[PDB]
Design a protein around this ligand. Structure first.
Ligand SMILES: [Zn+2]
Ligand SMILES: [Zn+2]
Ligand SMILES: [Zn+2]
Lengths: 43, 196, 158, 112, 141, 114, 133, 65, 84, 559, 263
């Protein structure tokens, strides 16, 4: 439940890559496999 | 599954006796195969055990917080003071025999999760039940007692096995099977069937 | 020198080495004619085709050339005598043996090679997941599609 | 590059040789260049090898290629298998893709 | 009282951040061989310091013990499974009528915690048991 | 739902006898005795005793599958010696020692204070 | 009902390469300088060491399922301490006026070099190895 | 949810030691570690049983009906 | 378009697929209470039986091998060699 | 696509799978309930009535029972409802839809099915509990593991159909696969890891066990083999008993690096008359390799004999291990104190090299190689420098590992693990990488806000110096995380893209087959190969042989 | 006396550390197991719930009841319901206890095993008595109630064994060691430097002589002497677990002997 409430989605150059700037803001690990991997993020 | 990306289904349950045992008389609630470790490099798992062991012993909450100065040594050092081999190994005896096990074993407590998705909730198994009205083909899902998908890919395999007959029997006698009458001049299903 | 060919001859030999208990101390009863002419004759009964005409009789020769090479280099006079002290009996057996095995290594009409191949390539392909060239899936894709815009072109001159 | 080579004494030895790898293609004009051994010049661009050396050669590279994809991964696959592919890709005298633009046009029945 | 600030990725561009305050603001005037190796506090520029690196994580990964002694992807897997775990999702599960609810008979707080589980209320509503495990080849089953 | 009742571990069902004695076919004076609703506890104990008899040429045992509680004891004895006897003896020698232990323990237990 | 080779050996080296119950022994032969020996021995059941006087014997006697005691009061080619059984595999021409052989005692190996053994040494499986004092 | 009657692992009755344990903590002002040992819980299979229990029932009882 | 028993070029040896269909088809007849041309050493399973009707070349079935042009060649299970 | 060439068929079943070491390679464990559902239309025949009637009496809810009884007219007598379900006198000609019984042939598959091996026929074995139970060495062809995979089962309905499965698609028949022209089923996990130990020269067994191990092998000739030792104690070696599993007539020579018909390292392999003479038994011998004891035993003794080889080897080795035990713990990842010293500094110099290159480069002294930016050359160096560093600290670690070290211990069997695993778990993890380059400057001229702009030093750009043991540092963590992700992502991609290719290939060749004139043509008849594989030889019946006439000096070819 | 011989060291209501010598390891074990799994005992194996206004589930509570230890000394004269010719149960094969608890006070009322109330006729045999070793005398904490919560049960305790279910085990935990110094070499210790400095030393060593440096390997010695200790849930006095253990095992053996006979 906590994890669902803290979720993030990104519709649609490289967007599923964990990105430098993400440090501090989005969890580096938590993310679904395949399908929407890297698109669905978790604060 | 542990807490380190290592899931597994039960494969059999053994009663206390058949289980390998500790000289202290302690026996495991669960046994995992050493082989699911070298490759997954999920070391923390191992560590956590070292820690959780010491902890349970000394009634101290084990602190496996990330970036800390907690060492596998400092811990092994603590566990020894507790009269146990500093790594988690402990001579163990084979339940059947009572003899000692030629190889000491990694024994300790480790937090394990009970994941949803339990066999009984999946065991579907049909043998010709209800079929779709539109295609006269078996229905989907097991809640409905449907059929399993013998899709494209499975077919190719059968073709590869050169098992012609089976194939026909799969794509016909089971699922779609229908008799149609045709005009010996215009191969169309335009022949009025008046059977009597 | 190591190429996949039907009939592991080396084995047949070993399987005579002890099926007839061959002693490396006494002399064989093999006639130079036996061996040489025998090996030769063996090469006549391998077959993969049976038309009685020129064309096909020539294909048949082609499809056996290599194996035969293997066969000749292995079943050579010295070898037979000096390398593995066979005897007219063992040797004679080894031959009758190869023939049969060969005949057993032929493909059976019906074998659906189309798929059998497609899959034999698709599978080990789905095992691929990773000195600056385009390889792996992408490239294989490049190929199968017969693309013209390949990313890593190159010309290798000597 | 490394190249095994028969030595006068019989055994294969290793006689390293200079080879130029290129980052761009134009086969048609490089063979003609002097000094190079036009007998061996090669390219991973089978299409080009096709247009220039004929299709029977193209088939070769086409395989030489596929092969490398599969073997660079340590994995092996019996010849025949890939052979069949390439050939099926090469019988119609040209380079027919495994795409729809190629084999579905093929001459086959409608249903396939 | 201005002892903290709220920084977004854009302003982050213009700042220098020390990880540990301590270990990064003492002057360099023997080292435990079992502790990991860290570089140095090379910067007469620090404008900020991290509240605590463990904070770069989020709910799910937060419950992993020592995820810093674990191969990258395995941490992501666990995070996806912690959501399929059983336990008491709410002390009032008995008064709620909802499509399926799975509750553990005897939930146990883990012997191995994270200084960040205190906020995720894990110890209070644990999901998992503390079983005595043995990594060993037994019946081959 | 596909789990067998626990009692099937120690209760013979229908058409199940505690023992079945079939003559081994490979060796002479050999016999494979199958035990029903019995596990390692007995199997291994009897296997061990059966190996004290010097007229015993062979003796092993196996629970072919954990799922089921049954096992097989194989016995080969010296010409003229019937393994069934070799089995009898063993069980006895076992009971005797057992009784013994029972006593000696009960003795000591009584000299104890607490 | 025979014996196939007798000879006292002097152990020159004893090597325990990452094994704790096995050592590969290499002892030379007293008498005929031509003869040398390479053997695998269970140092746990039969210790050995720097320069020992070892008596060796081969034979093929004192294949039906193995039995054990009783005969503890019967036959007894127990005039030795250590004994093994094995299967010999390859006979080799060390060339020159010398010839060698190879035996495998369930993995414990032995190579024997000499020449007059052309007769005294078997050509089949059977082959016991007896050692004493 | 209430103290497990008996230890999963070995079977040593444990459900009759929760209150005892708690008291040893609050009043006897002892550390979880010794409190355990005094209650006769010497092996870890039997120490995690109590040490880890999260007596949730005490929160389920606050629900009026 | 037929081909005399002579000029026969197809494999003398029976293909696995041919024998698996022969085996199936006879096994099926046997399962339908059809006469058995062999003596059962105590066999009961149709297939297992049919296997033994082949092992004793007593299966009155013939295989028609169509070539790719349209022609063919009729081989009898009595002729065909069963190595495999 | 989903209705004509791919349909939902009846008589299918699916559940979770788990390994079962006491099941034969070619069987499959079908949970009683599933067997009670799936049925098989068997016609009544004097060769069976007794069993058939007996089952019909057993009814649809006791295993060896049945459901439905079909008659002449085509009526269906439903055996679970029917005033006359306890009556019914079977009539020759009728049909008794019976439960699936033991030894039935069934098509068992795991998806995705990108093989023939993904679908194979297994002998049924009805058993308790509810998971399909399968032999481990059937694992790889289906590419399964037991972390939750589910598998599909289909039941032949026609007498022919069955035959087609038991004669063409049987697991036995598939051990030597035509694709890799080698076998496609080896020996894994415990059986492999163990068989090795059980083999060590240092490994001996005595009476009580020997007698059990022997008995354990079902095909035992009950003839106790004479001990390798008869001295102070009659001891057998590991090889000794294992050899019981290997049948007679199997021969196998090997020779690894230092082999020498006396293999001081218990190297290579030598098996004669089905008796293992020398060499430790591990992956190369028993793996699913080309030369393999399996490739040989299939070709020589027959598919079935070789099918059995598996269970036997397993039953024996498994038992032996069940009593020897085997495990792993952190301990197994700890390296010699002086070693970590030598390692930590091994890196210490790698860093100095990078640093010394860097300063060189910044002085513009560097000489740019041809075709590369002085910048490109710079990077490539450091990356090389760091890789070597990792690999040597790693090697450095691998040497400590005592033969008793379980990790190393599995690596030697070839049952899991490789240099890399050790190297990372024990010494330095390594240089992280995204898109083939070392971590980028997501921020302006820097990696994270914890570094100063322009900083190409290893720490800054993704070089995780620590080990999984020692633990990573935030930055290290984050970095290693980035790569981690790159992985998981192309993971999801490399799957679909390949899945697609797998099809285009399959459609493209679909209809190609070896016709009766040994030719290879597609539907049209258009010849594709005048002789299949150019030798009209079947891929499975092939093996790598050496053409003794190509190599060797001219003198040796003559000698 | 004859073979097998003991040497109790410790002893009390719950434990019995003792040395069992001159026996086969096979037996030491068979004994050990049997103790763990085949000694009979009385335990609730059926709960009839009348009212449960509690926070816990019926079967959840029922499960715990089953686990609550009950007296079992005279269990040898109580039958297995499956053998009693009664329909279901009776006072010849069972023991029925009642549990009734009402949340009276607004101060949480606890429900202990001491509240079970034998209703059936014990027939003068010591059997089925909530076993209590508490200090305060409140054997096991079954459940807790709120303001006005009810719990009205009726259990039927039956004879059973650890095999059908673990609730029926009287043993708890059994220590077991043999050859404290690895003289027998039945193990190969895992080390980093000195397997002797890294691996602890069992109390049991004190009761045995060291290995004597240069002494060869004793290749003929087998396992004699075992250092055990039986903990006891208490439904049975420790001495009994050991006896009844020995007994049971002995009967098991006898029944095979009796088998051949009827054969
Ligand atoms: Zn019409
Ligand atoms: Zn416990
Ligand atoms: Zn009654």
């Amino acid at each position: 439940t906590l994890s669902h409430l803290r979720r993030t989605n990104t519709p649609i150059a490289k967007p599923r890559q964990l990105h430098n700037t993400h440090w501090g803001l989005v969890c580096p690990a938590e993310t679904p496999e395949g399908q929407a991997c890297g698109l669905v993020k978790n604060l | 599954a542990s807490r380190h990306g290592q899931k597994g289904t039960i494969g059999i349950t053994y009663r206390r006796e058949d289980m390998p045992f500790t000289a202290e008389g302690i026996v495991p609630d669960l046994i995992i195969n050493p082989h699911a470790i070298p490759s997954r490099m999920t070391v923390a798992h191992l560590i956590e055990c070292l820690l959780s062991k010491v902890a349970a012993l000394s009634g101290n909450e084990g602190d496996a917080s990330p970036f800390t100065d907690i060492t596998v040594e400092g811990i092994s050092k603590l566990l020894r003071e507790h009269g146990y081999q500093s790594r988690g190994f402990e001579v163990m005896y084979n339940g059947h025999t009572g003899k000692k096990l030629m190889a000491q074993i990694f024994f300790g407590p480790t937090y394990y999760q009970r994941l949803r998705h339990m066999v009984d909730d999946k065991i579907h198994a049909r043998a010709r039940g209800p079929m779709q009205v539109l295609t006269r083909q078996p229905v989907e899902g097991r809640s409905r007692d449907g059929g399993l998908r013998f899709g494209e890919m499975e077919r190719d395999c059968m073709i590869a096995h050169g098992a012609a007959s089976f194939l026909k029997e799969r794509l016909m006698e089971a699922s779609d099977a229908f008799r149609v009458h045709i005009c010996g001049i215009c191969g169309l299903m335009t022949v009025i069937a008046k059977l009597n | 020198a190591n190429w996949p060919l039907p009939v592991n001859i080396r084995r047949i030999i070993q399987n005579a080495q002890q099926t007839f208990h061959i002693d490396h101390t006494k002399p064989s009863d093999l006639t130079i004619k036996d061996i040489v002419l025998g090996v030769k004759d063996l090469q006549e009964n391998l077959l993969v085709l049976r038309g009685k005409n020129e064309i096909i009789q020539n294909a048949q020769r082609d499809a056996v050339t290599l194996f035969c090479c293997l066969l000749r280099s292995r079943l050579a006079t010295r070898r037979v005598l000096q390398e593995y002290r066979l005897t007219k009996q063992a040797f004679d057996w080894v031959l009758s043996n190869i023939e049969a095995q060969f005949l057993r290594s032929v493909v059976h009409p019906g074998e659906m090679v189309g798929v059998l191949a497609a899959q034999s390539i698709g599978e080990p392909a789905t095992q691929m997941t990773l000195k600056k060239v385009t390889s792996g899936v992408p490239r294989l894709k490049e190929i199968l599609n017969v693309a013209k815009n390949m990313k890593t072109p190159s010309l290798t001159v000597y | 590059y490394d190249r095994k080579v028969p030595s006068p004494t019989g055994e294969y030895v290793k006689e390293p040789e200079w080879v130029l790898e290129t980052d761009g293609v134009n086969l048609s004009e490089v063979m003609t260049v002097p000094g190079i051994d036009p007998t061996r010049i090669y390219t991973n661009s089978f299409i080009d090898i096709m247009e220039v050396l004929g299709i029977e050669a193209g088939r070769a590279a086409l395989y030489k290629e596929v092969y490398n994809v599969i073997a660079s991964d340590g994995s092996y696959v019996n010849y025949r298998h890939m052979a069949l592919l390439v050939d099926v890709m090469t019988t119609q005298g040209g380079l027919t893709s495994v795409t729809r633009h190629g084999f579905n046009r093929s001459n086959t029945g409608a249903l396939m | 009282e201005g002892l903290v600030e709220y920084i977004d990725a854009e302003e982050e561009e213009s700042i220098l951040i020390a990880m540990q305050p301590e270990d990064l603001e003492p002057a360099e005037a023997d080292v435990d061989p079992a502790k990991r190796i860290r570089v140095s506090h090379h910067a007469t520029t620090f404008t900020h310091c991290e509240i605590h690196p463990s904070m770069i994580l989020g709910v799910a990964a937060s419950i992993i013990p020592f995820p810093d002694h674990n191969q990258s992807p395995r941490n992501t897997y666990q995070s996806a499974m912690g959501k399929q775990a059983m336990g008491v999702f709410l002390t009032n599960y008995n008064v709620r009528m909802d499509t399926m609810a799975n509750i553990l008979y005897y939930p146990q707080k883990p012997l191995g915690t994270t200084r960040a589980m205190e906020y995720l209320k894990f110890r209070e509503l644990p999901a998992g048991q503390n079983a005595i495990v043995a990594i060993a080849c037994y019946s081959g089953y | 739902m596909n789990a067998p009742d626990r009692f099937e571990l120690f209760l013979l069902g229908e058409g199940e006898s505690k023992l079945k004695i079939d003559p081994d076919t490979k060796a002479p004076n050999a016999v494979v005795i199958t035990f029903e609703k019995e596990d390692h506890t007995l199997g291994n104990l009897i296997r061990a005793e059966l190996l004290n008899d010097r007229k015993v040429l062979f003796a092993a045992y196996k629970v072919e599958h954990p799922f089921f509680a049954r096992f097989k004891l194989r016995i080969q004895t010296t010409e003229g010696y019937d393994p069934k006897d070799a089995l009898k003896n063993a069980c006895n020698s076992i009971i005797n020692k057992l009784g013994a232990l029972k006593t000696n323990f009960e003795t000591e237990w009584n000299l104890q204070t607490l | 009902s025979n014996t196939l080779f007798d000879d006292i050996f002097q152990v020159s080296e004893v090597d325990p390469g990452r094994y704790n119950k096995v050592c590969r022994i290499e002892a030379a032969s007293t008498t005929q300088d031509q003869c040398k020996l390479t053997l695998d021995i269970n140092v746990e059941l039969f210790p050995v060491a720097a320069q020992d006087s070892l008596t060796v014997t081969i034979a093929s006697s004192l294949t039906r399922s193995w039995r054990p005691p009783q005969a503890g009061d019967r036959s007894l080619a127990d005039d030795y301490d250590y004994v093994m059984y094995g299967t010999a595999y390859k006979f080799e021409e060390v060339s020159k006026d010398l010839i060698a052989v190879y035996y495998s005692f369930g993995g414990l190996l032995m190579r024997l070099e000499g020449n007059y053994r052309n007769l005294n040494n078997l050509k089949q499986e059977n082959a016991y190895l007896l050692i004493r004092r | 949810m209430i103290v497990p009657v008996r230890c999963f692992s070995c079977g040593k009755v444990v459900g009759d030691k929760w209150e005892s344990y708690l008291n040893l903590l609050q009043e006897d002002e002892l550390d979880e570690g010794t409190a355990l040992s005094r209650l006769g819980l010497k092996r870890y299979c039997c120490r995690r049983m109590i040490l880890t229990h999260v007596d949730l029932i005490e929160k389920f009882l606050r629900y009026n009906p | 378009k037929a081909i005399p028993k002579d000029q026969r070029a197809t494999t003398p040896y029976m293909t696995k697929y041919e024998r698996a269909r022969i085996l199936g088809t006879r096994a099926l007849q046997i399962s339908m209470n059809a006469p058995v041309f062999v003596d059962l050493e105590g066999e009961t399973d149709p297939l297992r039986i049919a296997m033994k009707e082949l092992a004793e070349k007593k299966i009155p079935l013939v295989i028609r091998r169509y070539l790719p042009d349209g022609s063919f060649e009729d081989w009898s299970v009595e002729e065909l060699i069963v190595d495999l | 696509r989903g209705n004509l060439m791919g349909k939902r068929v009846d008589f299918s079943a699916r559940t979770v799978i788990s390994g079962d070491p006491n099941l034969e390679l070619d069987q499959v464990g079908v949970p009683k309930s599933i067997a009670k559902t799936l049925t098989y239309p068997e016609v009544v025949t004097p060769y069976n009535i007794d069993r058939l009637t007996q089952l019909v009496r057993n009814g649809p809810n006791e295993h060896p029972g049945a459901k439905y009884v079909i008659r002449d007219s085509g009526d269906r007598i439903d055996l679970r409802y029917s005033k006359r379900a306890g009556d019914i006198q079977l009539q020759y000609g009728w049909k008794v839809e019976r439960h699936i019984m033991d030894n039935d042939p069934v098509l068992f598959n795991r998806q995705p099915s990108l093989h023939k091996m993904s679908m194979m026929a297994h002998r049924v074995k009805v058993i308790p509990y509810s998971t399909f139970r399968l032999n481990l060495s059937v694992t790889s062809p289906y590419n399964a593991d037991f972390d939750g995979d589910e598998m599909n089962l289909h039941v032949p309905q026609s007498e022919e159909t069955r035959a087609e499965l038991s004669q063409l698609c049987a697991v036995p028949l598939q051990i030597v696969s035509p694709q890799s022209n080698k076998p496609c089923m080896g020996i894994v996990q415990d059986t492999l890891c163990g068989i090795r130990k059980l083999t060590l020269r240092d490994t001996f067994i005595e009476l009580d066990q020997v007698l059990n191990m022997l008995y354990w092998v079902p095909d035992w000739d009950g003839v106790i083999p004479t001990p390798a030792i008869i001295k102070p104690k009659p001891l057998w070696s590991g090889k000794q008993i294992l050899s019981v599993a290997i049948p007679n007539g199997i021969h196998l020579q090997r020779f690894d690096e230092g082999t020498t018909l006396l293999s001081p390292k218990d190297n290579g392999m030598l098996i004669i008359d089905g008796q293992i003479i020398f060499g430790v038994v591990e992956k190369k011998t028993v793996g699913s390799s080309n030369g393999g004891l399996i490739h040989v035993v299939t070709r020589e003794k027959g598919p079935q004999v070789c099918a059995k080889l598996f269970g036997n080897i397993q039953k024996v080795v498994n038992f032996w291990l069940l009593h020897n035990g085997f495990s792993t713990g952190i301990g197994d990842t700890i390296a010699d104190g002086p070693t970590m010293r030598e390692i930590t500094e091994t890196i210490a110099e790698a860093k100095k090299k990078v640093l010394d290159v860097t300063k060189e480069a910044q002085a513009n002294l560097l000489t740019a190689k041809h075709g590369m930016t002085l910048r490109e050359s710079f990077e490539d160096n450091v990356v090389r420098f760091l890789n070597e560093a990792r690999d040597k600290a790693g090697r450095l670690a691998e040497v400590n590992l005592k033969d008793l070290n379980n990790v190393k211990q599995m690596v030697m069997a070839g049952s899991k693990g490789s240099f890399i695993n050790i190297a990372q778990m024990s010494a330095c993890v390594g240089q992280q990488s995204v898109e083939g380059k070392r971590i980028a400057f997501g921020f302006v001229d820097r990696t994270l806000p914890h570094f100063s702009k322009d900083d190409y030093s290893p720490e800054s750009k993704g070089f995780v110096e620590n080990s999984y043991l020692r633990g990573l540092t935030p930055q290290e963590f984050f970095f290693h995380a980035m790569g981690g992700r790159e992985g998981l992502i192309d993971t999801a991609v490399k799957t679909a893209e390949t899945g697609y290719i797998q099809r285009r290939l399959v459609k493209a060749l679909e209809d190609i087959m070896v016709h009766y004139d040994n030719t290879t043509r597609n539907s049209l008849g258009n010849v594709i190969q005048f002789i299949y594989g150019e030798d009209g030889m079947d891929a499975a019946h092939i093996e790598k042989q050496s053409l003794d006439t190509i190599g060797g000096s001219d003198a040796a070819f003559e000698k | 006396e004859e073979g097998p011989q003991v040497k109790i060291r410790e002893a009390s209501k719950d434990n019995v550390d003792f040395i069992l010598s001159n026996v086969d390891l096979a037996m030491a074990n068979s004994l050990r197991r049997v103790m763990i799994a085949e000694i009979p005992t009385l335990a609730i194996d059926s709960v009839e719930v009348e009212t449960n206004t509690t926070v816990l589930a019926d079967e959840f509570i029922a499960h715990r009841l089953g686990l609550i230890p009950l007296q079992s000394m005279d269990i040898e004269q109580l039958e297995y319901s499956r053998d009693c010719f009664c329909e279901d149960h009776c006072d010849k094969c069972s023991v029925v206890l009642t549990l009734q608890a009402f949340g009276e006070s607004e101060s949480t009322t606890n429900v202990y095993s001491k509240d079970l109330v034998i209703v059936s006729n014990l027939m003068g045999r010591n059997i089925g008595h909530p076993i209590i070793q508490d200090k305060e005398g409140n054997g096991v904490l079954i459940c807790k109630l709120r303001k006005g919560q009810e719990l009205k049960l009726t259990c039927v305790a039956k004879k059973g064994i650890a095999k059908e279910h673990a609730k029926w085990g009287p043993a708890a935990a059994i220590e077991f060691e043999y050859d404290p110094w690895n003289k027998l070499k039945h193990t190969d210790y895992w080390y980093e430097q000195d397997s002797a400095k890294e691996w602890p030393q069992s109390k049991n060593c004190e009761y045995e002589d060291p290995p004597n440096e240069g002494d060869p390997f004793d290749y003929k010695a087998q396992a004699d002497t075992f250092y055990m200790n039986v903990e006891s849930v208490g439904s049975i006095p420790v001495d009994q677990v050991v006896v009844r253990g020995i007994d049971t095992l002995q009967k098991k053996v006898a029944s095979i002997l009796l088998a051949l006979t009827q054969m």
